[PDB]
Amino acid sequence: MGATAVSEWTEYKTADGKTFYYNNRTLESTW
Amino acid sequence: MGATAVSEWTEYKTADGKTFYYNNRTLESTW
Amino acid sequence: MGATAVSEWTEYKTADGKTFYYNNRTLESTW
Amino acid sequence: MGATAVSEWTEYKTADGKTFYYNNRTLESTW
């Protein structure tokens, strides 16, 4: 069982946002 | 260390939304 | 050290509604 | 005991919209 970090630098600019964009964190410190 | 972390960095640019993006991070701390 | 580290350094600059990107990022440390 | 580290840099400017990029990469420290 360890320590856990998510840390995401997501600058996403669509000019016309008819967007298709899937984003998941699965992030476990072992419950 | 006994730890897990996710240092993703992304500058994304697109004009028109019809483009396809998918992201599935997973990180799991067990040492 | 002990367990598991990732990085990404992303510059995606495609204007046209068309690009296909799929990312699937996993960092194990397990029992 | 066991520890792994992955990295990349990703640089895509496509003129005429075209690119497919599936990018699935593990890392597998301990087991």
UniProtKB/Swiss-Prot annotation, chains A, B, C, D:
Domains: entry comment: The FF domains bind the phosphorylated C-terminus of the largest subunit of RNA polymerase II, probably mediate interaction with HTATSF1 and preferentially bind peptides with the consensus sequence [DE](2-5)-[FWY]-[DE](2-5). The WW domains bind Pro-rich domains.
Function: Transcription factor that binds RNA polymerase II and inhibits the elongation of transcripts from target promoters. Regulates transcription elongation in a TATA box-dependent manner. Necessary for TAT-dependent activation of the human immunodeficiency virus type 1 (HIV-1) promoter.
Annotated localization: Nucleus
Range of the intact protein held here: 428 to 457 of 1098
Tissue expression per record: Detected in brain neurons.
Inducing factors: Up-regulated in brain tissue from patients with Huntington disease.
Assembly description: Binds formin. Interacts (via the second WW domain) with TREX1 (via proline-rich region). Binds RNA polymerase II, HD and SF1.
Signal peptide: none
Residue span(s) of domain WW: 3-31
Protein's UniProt name: Transcription elongation regulator 1
